[PDB]
């Protein structure tokens, strides 16, 4: 259950964009998605939700993609940026978290473009 624009466009991205960034890493060699590996429950660990302004991890994004919370990956992506935003908010600066998250949204679109070319030719 995904629908939105094209069922694959979102579902496809579910596994494509979601995976690409979570498999993604930073110049150091480790996951840029590391800090966005898992988003608590938005209720279970409110501290995280208290600290953050717009929490949402790669997991929650895919979660919303199929949940019909996006209907368009551009929205997912916006959350992917928010994913990166929670990075600068939750973790500590001077740490890979900030440069990594920035890279995440970057990988995301790189994966978004190749994705479209893969769903055509």
């Amino acid at each position: 259950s995904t629908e939105g624009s094209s069922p694959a466009y979102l579902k496809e991205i579910l596994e494509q964009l979601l995976e690409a960034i979570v498999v993604a890493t930073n110049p150091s060699g480790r996951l840029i998605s590391e800090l966005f590996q898992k988003l608590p429950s938005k209720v279970q660990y409110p501290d995280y939700y208290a600290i953050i302004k717009e929490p949402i991890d790669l997991k929650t994004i895919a979660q919303r993609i199929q949940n019909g919370s996006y209907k368009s990956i551009h929205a997912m992506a916006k959350d992917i940026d928010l994913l990166a935003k929670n990075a600068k908010t939750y973790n500590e600066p001077g740490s890979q978290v900030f440069k990594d998250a920035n890279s995440i949204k970057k990988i995301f679109y790189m994966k978004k473009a190749e994705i479209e070319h893969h769903e055509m030719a």
């Binding site: 480790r30 996951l31 590391e34 800090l35 590996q37 740490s95 890979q96 990594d100």
Partner: peptide, 20 residues
């Protein structure tokens, strides 16, 4: 990803570049 309890490596951080 988890079929049971236990199995959890946190301790400190996790962000890249972290090495000792």
């Amino acid at each position: 990803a988890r079929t049971k309890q236990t199995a959890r490596k946190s301790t400190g951080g996790k962000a890249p570049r972290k090495q000792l």
